[PDB]
Write an enzyme that holds these catalytic residues in place. Structure first.
Site, PDB file in Angstrom:
ATOM      1  N   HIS A   1       0.799  -1.224   0.000  1.00  0.00           N
ATOM      2  CA  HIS A   1       0.000   0.000   0.000  1.00  0.00           C
ATOM      3  C   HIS A   1       0.831   1.272   0.000  1.00  0.00           C
ATOM      4  O   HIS A   1       0.277   2.342  -0.280  1.00  0.00           O
ATOM      5  CB  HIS A   1      -0.940   0.053   1.215  1.00  0.00           C
TER       6      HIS A   1
ATOM      7  N   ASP B   1      -2.583 -11.208  -1.355  1.00  0.00           N
ATOM      8  CA  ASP B   1      -3.135 -10.634  -0.134  1.00  0.00           C
ATOM      9  C   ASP B   1      -4.609 -10.291  -0.354  1.00  0.00           C
ATOM     10  O   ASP B   1      -5.029  -9.961  -1.463  1.00  0.00           O
ATOM     11  CB  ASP B   1      -2.313  -9.379   0.224  1.00  0.00           C
TER      12      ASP B   1
ATOM     13  N   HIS C   1      -6.224  -7.773   0.471  1.00  0.00           N
ATOM     14  CA  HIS C   1      -6.430  -6.362   0.166  1.00  0.00           C
ATOM     15  C   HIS C   1      -5.782  -5.990  -1.157  1.00  0.00           C
ATOM     16  O   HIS C   1      -4.777  -6.574  -1.566  1.00  0.00           O
ATOM     17  CB  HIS C   1      -5.873  -5.465   1.266  1.00  0.00           C
TER      18      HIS C   1
ATOM     19  N   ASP D   1      -4.023 -12.993   4.655  1.00  0.00           N
ATOM     20  CA  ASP D   1      -5.295 -12.648   5.281  1.00  0.00           C
ATOM     21  C   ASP D   1      -6.507 -13.133   4.485  1.00  0.00           C
ATOM     22  O   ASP D   1      -7.643 -12.820   4.861  1.00  0.00           O
ATOM     23  CB  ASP D   1      -5.374 -11.136   5.549  1.00  0.00           C
TER      24      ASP D   1
ATOM     25  N   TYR E   1      -3.242 -11.832   9.603  1.00  0.00           N
ATOM     26  CA  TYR E   1      -3.262 -11.400  10.992  1.00  0.00           C
ATOM     27  C   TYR E   1      -3.691 -12.467  11.992  1.00  0.00           C
ATOM     28  O   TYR E   1      -3.606 -12.218  13.196  1.00  0.00           O
ATOM     29  CB  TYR E   1      -4.149 -10.148  11.124  1.00  0.00           C
TER      30      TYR E   1
HETATM   31  C1  LIG Z   1      -4.979  -1.429   6.723  1.00  0.00           C
HETATM   32  C2  LIG Z   1      -5.663  -2.722   7.046  1.00  0.00           C
HETATM   33  C3  LIG Z   1      -5.125  -3.916   6.413  1.00  0.00           C
HETATM   34  C4  LIG Z   1      -4.002  -3.916   5.702  1.00  0.00           C
HETATM   35  C5  LIG Z   1      -3.597  -5.176   5.086  1.00  0.00           C
HETATM   36  O1  LIG Z   1      -3.719  -6.291   5.570  1.00  0.00           O
HETATM   37  N1  LIG Z   1      -3.096  -5.023   3.828  1.00  0.00           N
HETATM   38  O2  LIG Z   1      -2.756  -6.157   3.209  1.00  0.00           O
HETATM   39  C6  LIG Z   1      -6.731  -2.851   7.848  1.00  0.00           C
HETATM   40  C7  LIG Z   1      -7.393  -1.696   8.534  1.00  0.00           C
HETATM   41  C8  LIG Z   1      -8.712  -1.421   7.841  1.00  0.00           C
HETATM   42  C9  LIG Z   1      -7.642  -1.970  10.023  1.00  0.00           C
HETATM   43  O3  LIG Z   1      -8.073  -3.052  10.378  1.00  0.00           O
HETATM   44  C10 LIG Z   1      -7.366  -0.884  10.997  1.00  0.00           C
HETATM   45  C11 LIG Z   1      -7.190  -1.134  12.363  1.00  0.00           C
HETATM   46  C12 LIG Z   1      -6.933  -0.092  13.245  1.00  0.00           C
HETATM   47  C13 LIG Z   1      -6.846   1.235  12.753  1.00  0.00           C
HETATM   48  N2  LIG Z   1      -6.593   2.313  13.591  1.00  0.00           N
HETATM   49  C14 LIG Z   1      -7.246   2.472  14.888  1.00  0.00           C
HETATM   50  C15 LIG Z   1      -5.666   3.357  13.151  1.00  0.00           C
HETATM   51  C16 LIG Z   1      -7.021   1.472  11.381  1.00  0.00           C
HETATM   52  C17 LIG Z   1      -7.279   0.427  10.532  1.00  0.00           C
HETATM   53  K   LIG Z   2      -4.302  -8.519  -3.474  1.00  0.00           K
HETATM   54 ZN   LIG Z   3      -3.961  -7.495   3.537  1.00  0.00          ZN
END
Ligand SMILES: CC(/C=C/C(=O)NO)=C\[C@@H](C)C(=O)c1ccc(N(C)C)cc1
Ligand SMILES: [K+]
Ligand SMILES: [Zn+2]
Ligand SMILES: [K+]
Length: 357
Positions: free
Chosen positions: A133, A170, A172, A263, A303
């Site tokens: 990302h 992945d 995402h 994931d 995760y």
């Molecule tokens: C970015 C992501 C996965 C990335 C991934 O796996 N890319 O491959 C998941 C986000 C939606 C998430 O769950 C999250 C959790 C806490 C938070 N804050 C409290 C700051 C902000 C976002």
């Molecule tokens: K992907």
């Molecule tokens: Zn991911």
């Protein structure tokens, strides 16, 4: 000759200062290494040293302005670091993040070196922070630097590679990789990901299959968005067999880089898919038929500590040449997956003869 593996304890030296249960945590990589050892796989790999990425290497993708700013994060307080991380979508900061991120990028470049010079057949970096990302001038989604985008451009410059395939399994969308190469026909980006018409993070219209690249890059960006949850091995195997691998053989890459997040594996707390870890043995196996097997995997998301470790082990068995596993699931895709695959094929049909049926 063998399979390389990069891991360094520095990958554990950053964490969410304001949330001790944050999902993107040191335990992700420690649990992977623990299972690689207990399964006897770690001792079968060639241990490859990590290295810190250089400024020039980061510049291949990131702006000097952004590199300098991230480097300054090692001198900020829990409040200041919180000030800068709030400027980005879904990230945290920590005084050790930059140092680890530089070793995360460098670990991939180390494996590209060894694979492109025929020292190793393939390799896997067990790295965090993730990368797919990260964008030219911003952090995003737990990523600081775009490990695989850097590695692709590094391969072209340092090893005379003309064509790189990036496969992103992945759950995402790696929009950062997409953006960096959007206009570039020399780097083909393929991403299969949960989308649900944009309700799933990162919530981008550009994650849909209508985003096929731009200008000279039209046809070299391939998004496969899932619009229902619970996809299974049969859906990923079908996607690879009828869409990705046909384009891969027609593209003729000289290097394959995998954004190897886990994931989508059964058990992930947020990905929502039902892909058995064994599936990734098959997906890895298929990718070995391309580019003389010049294949480098790098950890992205995933995760559930056990599920992610199991996915890495499954991929590693195939890198090492072990027989493909028995697939517990059906080898037949569902209708939603076929509709997604059909739509992406329709969006990419005009640029790939291997998709004309
Ligand atoms: C970015 C992501 C996965 C990335 C991934 O796996 N890319 O491959 C998941 C986000 C939606 C998430 O769950 C999250 C959790 C806490 C938070 N804050 C409290 C700051 C902000 C976002
Ligand atoms: K992907
Ligand atoms: Zn991911
Ligand atoms: K591209």
């Amino acid at each position: 000759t063998g399979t390389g593996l990069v891991y360094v304890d520095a990958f554990t030296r950053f964490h969410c200062l304001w949330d001790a249960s944050h999902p993107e945590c040191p335990a992700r990589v420690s649990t992977v290494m623990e299972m690689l050892e207990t399964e006897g796989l770690l001792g079968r790999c060639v241990q490859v040293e990590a290295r810190a990425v250089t400024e020039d290497e980061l510049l291949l993708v990131h702006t000097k302005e952004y590199v300098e700013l991230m480097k300054s994060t090692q001198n900020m307080t829990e409040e200041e670091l919180k000030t800068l991380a709030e400027k980005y979508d879904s990230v945290y900061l920590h005084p050790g993040f930059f140092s680890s991120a530089c070793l995360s990028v460098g670990s991939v470049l180390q494996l590209v070196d060894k694979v492109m010079t025929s020292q190793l057949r393939n390799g896997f970096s067990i790295n965090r922070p993730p990368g797919h990302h990260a964008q030219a001038d911003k952090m995003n989604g737990f990523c600081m630097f775009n490990n695989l985008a850097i590695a692709a451009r590094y391969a072209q410059k340092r090893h005379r590679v003309q064509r790189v395939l990036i496969v992103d399994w992945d759950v995402h969308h790696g929009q950062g990789i997409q953006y960096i190469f959007e206009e570039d026909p020399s780097v083909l980006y393929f991403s299969v990901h949960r989308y649900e018409d944009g309700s799933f993070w990162p919530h981008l219209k550009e994650s849909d299959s209508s985003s096929v690249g731009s200008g000279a890059g039209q046809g070299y960006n391939i998004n496969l968005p899932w619009n229902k949850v619970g996809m299974e091995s049969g859906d990923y195997i079908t996607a690879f067999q009828q869409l990705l691998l046909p384009v891969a053989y027609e593209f003729q890459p000289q290097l394959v880089l995998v954004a190897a997040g886990f994931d989508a594996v059964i058990g992930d707390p947020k990905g929502g898919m039902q892909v058995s870890p064994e599936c990734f043995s098959i997906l890895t196996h298929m990718l070995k038929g391309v580019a003389q097997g010049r294949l480098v995997l790098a950890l992205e998301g995933g995760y559930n500590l056990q599920s992610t470790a199991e996915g890495v082990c499954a991929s590693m068995r195939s890198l090492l040449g072990d027989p493909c596993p028995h697939l517990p699931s059906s080898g037949a895709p569902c209708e939603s997956a076929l509709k997604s695959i059909s739509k992406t094929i329709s969006d990419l049909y005009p640029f790939w003869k291997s998709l004309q049926t």
